[PDB]
Write a protein that binds this DNA or RNA. Structure first.
Lengths: 264, 264
RNA sequence: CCGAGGUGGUGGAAUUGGUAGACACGCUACCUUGAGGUGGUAGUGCCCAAUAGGGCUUACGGGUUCAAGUCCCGUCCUCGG
RNA sequence: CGAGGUGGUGGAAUUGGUAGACACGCUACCUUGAGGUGGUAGUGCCCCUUACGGGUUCAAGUCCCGUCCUCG
């Protein structure tokens, strides 16, 4: 019985979910994704994440791969599966791949985007899709300040109390801070990440644009190698896993990342 | 006991509501808005809309005015209010006004935007915020075709069947069709609108960009003065009342319309 | 003696009246698991008989107001030289 | 030179995707303009369902078989 390994571009809205990692007592994208992915392959399927996102953490460039004997047409994995998927979780594409591929271990780099709503008043539309921030922000200071995190560094100061990896070291590829309308977007990328790194970078990074801290403060915290010094972690309520990287050899479809209108 | 008349910029998400219209035994923005607007002024408040929005029709430039004796600072109408408001419905600003003002009648022109998702696969993020469309669209044909509805016309063909009087005539200011990413936005404006006017224009307008109809077809339907001949209506599931107009004399705050990131 | 200050078990917050304890650590039991930590769920306060849905809680009783840890009046305090 | 049988009607459903969208009628419960129009909710079983039985698939208004029809 020949087996098949295919990849899927999962895009979801953790608005109403407790993270990706399946549970027992609560809702988890995975659980669902599998629940339906299997209902297709007609054989208990189990999928592999590529970035075990947190709880209430939206995703649009999430990638997963699962093995299966079931030989579907192609529209199946697509419409087929989405067909049994709750409106908040859907597929974007599918592409068979070689055993050498592994949505989590074949990844070369992952990328996130954070959407901050910078207005004194709460927002309605996409309420659970963006983070609220009254205090005025400065996209320039933030960007500037946040330019020392570039390169291989010891994000200890920015890593969550507990974790899993061994080292607090990571290589940040790019980290640009922009502003579209009253919205401030944080775009970042790095080989891999440490627990809550992004929800922390921003966290503090927010302080700088609010002049509640100087610009150097960032590099200061970093060099300080100490978590308890930097602003509190930010509300996952706006972290979007916009894109992951894989070797060109595997060749995976690259659609938009947004989210929504935001250009690539 | 002196009375006060103030205006509010209500922004909501009809995702989970039965439309703007106040109802009994159901959820309606109004009901809520009042429910809370009053809690503050501490005297059964009743508001006046400026554009009765159908069911599941988002709004961001919605304007309403209500009278009240209650002399609240201005933190109430802006914050105090929202505080008693469900995440999907919030205020954006408030500005006292003269009796001569009336959110619905003082209006000189109203404007909407329609967001179409043009991808063969369903979308997750903002699931109830955008209309899903499989077959490929042509932003150019659509735009082109949709250029004869400009000016005073007899939108009979485009008006929701029931009617007898108060004319099928309307003056369309501008109607441009664009495309941002796999998203297709329809932006339109006119002195006022006829029942479903927009949800129909698009409706058909969708057909043209799908080459399921020629370009002239639009002007044909229009001139044909007949509902049954134009493609069915369009899902309210993406109609956003982005903005309304009022005389400069009243002077009302003009923030962004979007929705979301979409620029003005 | 005039002035500082009193928020859970801790560290540590609260758009400058808006409507609590954000972020984190530490423990009680629970879940996955096999008990590798990690990850989730409830507590870690007080009542309403339990049930239940909820309600009261920011040193303690009063007041102001549509709304108060946040303004005001005092009660017990905890200090600064 | 033509071919069919989805609710009270018309009349649509991606590539076999997971049902009646849209519009008319019909009954409710509301409902300001101020010339009186509008909102929402209901409109196939009973305490599963697209003439009705089959077959194939993870998947069936949608392909194959049948049965009774509608038709040129």
């Amino acid at each position: 019985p020949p087996v098949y390994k295919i990849a899927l571009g999962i895009e979801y809205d953790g608005s109403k979910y407790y993270g990706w990692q399946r549970q027992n007592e609560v809702r988890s994208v995975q659980e669902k994704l599998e629940k339906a992915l299997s209902q297709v392959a007609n054989e208990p399927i189990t999928v592999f994440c590529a970035g075990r996102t947190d709880a209430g953490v939206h995703g649009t460039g999430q990638v997963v791969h699962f093995e299966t004997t079931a030989l579907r047409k192609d529209a199946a994995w697509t419409l087929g599966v989405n067909a049994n998927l709750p409106g908040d979780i859907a597929v974007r594409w599918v592409k068979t791949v070689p055993d050498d591929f592994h949505a989590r271990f074949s990844a070369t780099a992952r990328r996130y985007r954070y959407i901050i709503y910078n207005h004194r008043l709460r927002p309605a539309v996409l309420s659970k899709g963006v983070t609220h921030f009254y205090e005025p922000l400065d996209a320039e200071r933030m960007h500037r300040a946040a330019q020392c995190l570039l390169g291989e560094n010891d994000f200890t100061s920015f890593r969550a109390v507990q974790c899993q990896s061994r080292t607090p070291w990571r290589n940040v590829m790019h980290i640009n801070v922009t502003r579209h309308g009253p919205y401030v977007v944080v775009d970042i990328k790095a080989n891999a990440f440490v627990h809550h790194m992004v929800r922390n970078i921003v966290g503090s990074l927010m302080e700088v644009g609010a002049h509640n801290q100087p610009e150097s403060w960032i590099a200061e915290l970093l060099a300080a190698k100490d978590r308890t010094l930097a602003a509190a972690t930010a509300k996952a309520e706006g972290l979007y896993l916009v894109a992951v990287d894989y070797p060109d050899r595997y060749d995976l479809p690259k659609p938009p990342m947004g989210p929504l209108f935001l250009a690539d």
